[PDB]
Amino acid sequence: KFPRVKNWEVGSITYDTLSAQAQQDGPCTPRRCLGSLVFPPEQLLSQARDFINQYYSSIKRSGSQAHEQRLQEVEAEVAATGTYQLRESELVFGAKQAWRNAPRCVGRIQWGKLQVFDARDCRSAQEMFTYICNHIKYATNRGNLRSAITVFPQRCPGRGDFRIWNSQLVRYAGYRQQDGSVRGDPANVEITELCIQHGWTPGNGRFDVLPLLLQAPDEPPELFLLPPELVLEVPLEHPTLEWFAALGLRWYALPAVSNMLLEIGGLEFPAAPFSGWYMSTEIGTRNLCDPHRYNILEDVAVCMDLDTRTTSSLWKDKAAVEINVAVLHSYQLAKVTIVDHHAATASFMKHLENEQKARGGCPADWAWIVPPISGSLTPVFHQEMVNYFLSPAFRYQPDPW
Amino acid sequence: FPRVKNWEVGSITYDTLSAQAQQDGPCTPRRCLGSLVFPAPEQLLSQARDFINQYYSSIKRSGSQAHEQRLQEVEAEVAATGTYQLRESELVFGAKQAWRNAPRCVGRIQWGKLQVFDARDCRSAQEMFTYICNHIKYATNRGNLRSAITVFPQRCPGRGDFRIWNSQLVRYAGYRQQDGSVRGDPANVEITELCIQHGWTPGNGRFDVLPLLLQAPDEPPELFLLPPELVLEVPLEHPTLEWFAALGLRWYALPAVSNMLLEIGGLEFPAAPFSGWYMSTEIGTRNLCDPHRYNILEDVAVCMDLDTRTTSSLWKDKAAVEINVAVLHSYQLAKVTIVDHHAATASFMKHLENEQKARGGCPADWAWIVPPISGSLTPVFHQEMVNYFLSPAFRYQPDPW
Ligand code: HEM
Numbered sequence: 001k002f003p004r005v006k007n008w009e010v011g012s013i014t015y016d017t018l019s020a021q022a023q024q025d026g027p028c029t030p031r032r033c034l035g036s037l038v039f040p041p042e043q044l045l046s047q048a049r050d051f052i053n054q055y056y057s058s059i060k061r062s063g064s065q066a067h068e069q070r071l072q073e074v075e076a077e078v079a080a081t082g083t084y085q086l087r088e089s090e091l092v093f094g095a096k097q098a099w100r101n102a103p104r105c106v107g108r109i110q111w112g113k114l115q116v117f118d119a120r121d122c123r124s125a126q127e128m129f130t131y132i133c134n135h136i137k138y139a140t141n142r143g144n145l146r147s148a149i150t151v152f153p154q155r156c157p158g159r160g161d162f163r164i165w166n167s168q169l170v171r172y173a174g175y176r177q178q179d180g181s182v183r184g185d186p187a188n189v190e191i192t193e194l195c196i197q198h199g200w201t202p203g204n205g206r207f208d209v210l211p212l213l214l215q216a217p218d219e220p221p222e223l224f225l226l227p228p229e230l231v232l233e234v235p236l237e238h239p240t241l242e243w244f245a246a247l248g249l250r251w252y253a254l255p256a257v258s259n260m261l262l263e264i265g266g267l268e269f270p271a272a273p274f275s276g277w278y279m280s281t282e283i284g285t286r287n288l289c290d291p292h293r294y295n296i297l298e299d300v301a302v303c304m305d306l307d308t309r310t311t312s313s314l315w316k317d318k319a320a321v322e323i324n325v326a327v328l329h330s331y332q333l334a335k336v337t338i339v340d341h342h343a344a345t346a347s348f349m350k351h352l353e354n355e356q357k358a359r360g361g362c363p364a365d366w367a368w369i370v371p372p373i374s375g376s377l378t379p380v381f382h383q384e385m386v387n388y389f390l391s392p393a394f395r396y397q398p399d400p401w
Numbered sequence: 402f403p404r405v406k407n408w409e410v411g412s413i414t415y416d417t418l419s420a421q422a423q424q425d426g427p428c429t430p431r432r433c434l435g436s437l438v439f440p441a442p443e444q445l446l447s448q449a450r451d452f453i454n455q456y457y458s459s460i461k462r463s464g465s466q467a468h469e470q471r472l473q474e475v476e477a478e479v480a481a482t483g484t485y486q487l488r489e490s491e492l493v494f495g496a497k498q499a500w501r502n503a504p505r506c507v508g509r510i511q512w513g514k515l516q517v518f519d520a521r522d523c524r525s526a527q528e529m530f531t532y533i534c535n536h537i538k539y540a541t542n543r544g545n546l547r548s549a550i551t552v553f554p555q556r557c558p559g560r561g562d563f564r565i566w567n568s569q570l571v572r573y574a575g576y577r578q579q580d581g582s583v584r585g586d587p588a589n590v591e592i593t594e595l596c597i598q599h600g601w602t603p604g605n606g607r608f609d610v611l612p613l614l615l616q617a618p619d620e621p622p623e624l625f626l627l628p629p630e631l632v633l634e635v636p637l638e639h640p641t642l643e644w645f646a647a648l649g650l651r652w653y654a655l656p657a658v659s660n661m662l663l664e665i666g667g668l669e670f671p672a673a674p675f676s677g678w679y680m681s682t683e684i685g686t687r688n689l690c691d692p693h694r695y696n697i698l699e700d701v702a703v704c705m706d707l708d709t710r711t712t713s714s715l716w717k718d719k720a721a722v723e724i725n726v727a728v729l730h731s732y733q734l735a736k737v738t739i740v741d742h743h744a745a746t747a748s749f750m751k752h753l754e755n756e757q758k759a760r761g762g763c764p765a766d767w768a769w770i771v772p773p774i775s776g777s778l779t780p781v782f783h784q785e786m787v788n789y790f791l792s793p794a795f796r797y798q799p800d801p802w
Pocket residue numbers: 095099102104105106107110114147148149274275276277278279282339344368394
């Protein structure tokens with residue numbers, strides 16, 4: 001009744017008693033496992049009591065005066081208004097816990113260090129842009145990246161909502177041709193089409209930084225040229241392959257997800273961008289080598305004069321490793337926070353041991369924690385993991401169209 | 402009906418075969434346990450009935466005279482004897498379907514090409530050993546490997562099982578050491594202790610081939626040494642790094658799993674060893690580089706002059722790539738069948754397309770299908786998969802000791 005979890009490298013066993021708190025049902029049934037799939041009125045009082053109890057237990061103040069008090073005012077707020085406002089300290093606690101509960105994040109060893117900006121009195125895209133711009137420069141911090149989340153107003157009935165129409169705050173463009181294919185990033189060919197449609201002059205480059213499309217409630221989105229000084233980017237060069245610089249590759253410093261719905265205590269924030277710092281396989285393996293992304297793998301292999309005529313030469317594996325080397329080398333010479341996948345997974349193993357002592361386990365999505373190159377060379381590969389949904393949480397949400 | 406996406410191409414299929422999945426798996430809507438390694442005549446009747454239905458569908462004779470004859474016959478024999486006997490053609494189809502149904506096997510493009518050896522008339526451990534020697538010889542075929550299975554008598558009321566105590570037919574010894582360590586393969590310390598306990602005179606090399614421990618019904622296990630010239634081995638060398646041959650590493654040609662139970666229409670064969678050929682990553686990455694196996698990675702990177710003081714140099718990844726290069730080149734030099742992870746995952750993609758057209762789906766365990774290096778460089782990384790249990794099946798079973 002409590003899942004037995006083994007680590008096959010060392011042979012240690014733990015039990016995930018924490019999984020007994022799984023709220024939102026997952027996709028799996030005894031008949032079939034769906035773990036490999038990417039996207040698989042007064043109910044607000046159940047989700048709020050549980051959250052407020054979470055807060056006070058975590059400050060050793062369960063079951064004492066201040067706990068009762070906070071229970072009544074949310075009772076009376078929703079009674080009067082049909083929703084409630086979070087205290088500053090609660091929202092801070094809610095933000096850090098959602099990160100801590102994100103089963104796909106390998107960087108949660110950092111969950112306790114999180115800078116929370118409160119944009120709950122926001123109104124109009126003119127202010128949105130400023131709140132985002134405060135975040136970006138704070139998080140970027142001239143290359144010493146700092147984790148941050150900005151929280152725009154929550155959701156109320158009978159009124160439109162705040163949304164960042166882009167998936168991230170920094171994304172490159174994707175342009176079709178006289179032949180359908182793409183110059184730039186193929187992942188963003190849709191939002192790129194929206195920006196052009198909404199009044200932005202298309203560029204001629206593989207690495208044009210898209211403009212933001214920000215949406216105040218019930219009003220049509222507005223384009224916003226991000227200040228180029230605010231967008232810190234890293235030209236890519238290799239330590240010893242002098243020609244690599246010539247391939248003209250860049251990536252941007254700050255990975256800032258802007259499309260996920262933060263959910264705290266039954267309250268929903270459709271705009272709540274969080275940012276951290278990249279793990280290098282994200283950029284070098286996925287962004288640049290995925291066949292449907294920049295798909296640079298064979299071009300780096302020609303430059304290395306590899307045998308691309310036979311798969312058993314492992315030319316793919318070789319080119320990919322050096323691409324990752326160039327990424328790490330480039331972020332370090334530019335002095336931008338980045339972590340390699342060996343350091344990151346080792347830290348996650350340390351995270352799991354922390355969490356086992358602290359909360360009785362940790363929800364983890366094996367298919368996403370295990371890096372996309374050299375999987376079984378990292379210790380998470382040999383760690384069994386239990387996936388489930390805890391609250392508060394980051395959730396995916398529809399696109400607003 | 403679960404919907405399944407390929408993220409490299411965009412295509413979408415629905416896995417309707419999943420609806421027929423019989424025995425239940427480890428996951429619930431509360432929590433996924435996909436990453437875990439090791440998760441009455443009337444039911445015998447119902448299992449058998451369904452298998453017979455399958456077999457008569459496969460010969461394009463569903464609902465014919467022969468079909469009802471067999472259904473009625475099996476109830477008769479279960480009524481009279483508590484069990485029944487497979488016809489030979491049924492046993493060949495059921496061994497093939499069992500491979501076909503194995504969710505963790507990436508080599509299933511070959512499932513129809515399988516050589517079925519009927520040893521259900523076997524009587525002793527000594528006759529068992531001769532059947533096994535003939536399997537190894539046929540399958541090895543002087544380095545031109547052929548897929549085979551040998552099927553020993555089924556579990557039955559009144560008598561104990563046949564069992565092969567070794568987990569594979571070819572395995573290297575693992576001796577505990579003077580300072581707690583293991584010389585040889587640490588995966589095989591238990592079975593090495595059992596061979597010694599049963600009169601085997603141990604060696605002291607790192608690549609000592611283990612003898613067979615064979616269990617006849619209601620007998621102690623009997624020890625059998627494999628004829629040296631029956632076990633084709635491959636010395637490992639690297640096509641450019643000449644110092645690599647001085648590591649003295651070898652692996653054997655034939656991967657023959659022998660501790661799994663074959664289930665066909667409710668009948669159980671606890672002894673039914675099967676073999677194919679290796680994918681290069683099993684040897685190069687897992688068997689040689691796992692920290693709890695031969696653990697050669699650091700020593701190779703030192704020889705390569707890599708800088709092992711910092712993870713960010715990707716010395717682990719670079720050293721592993723060459724070990725796989727070495728495995729592939731050595732088996733081609735020796736003219737021993739081998740497939741790399743790029744070819745193998747590309748054939749597994751064709752298997753999923755063939756299987757979609759033929760059965761409406763295909764069971765697959767993503768975390769086992771994706772190679773342990775260069776995961777997202779193969780096409781199976783970007784393929785969602787549904788995992789479930791079909792019969793006939795190979796199943797794990799406890800050790801007989
Ligand atoms: C501080 C350094 C951080 C690192 C190194 C890191 C690393 C990663 C990586 C590699 C992924 C896999 C995502 C993918 O491959 O698409 C991920 C997922 C995720 N992370 Fe983090 N992260 C960091 C900070 C954060 C922060 C600050 C938050 C929120 C407060 C966060 C929340 C999430 C969420 C919600 C996901 C799942 C997103 C998805 O599935 O698309 N992470 N993280």
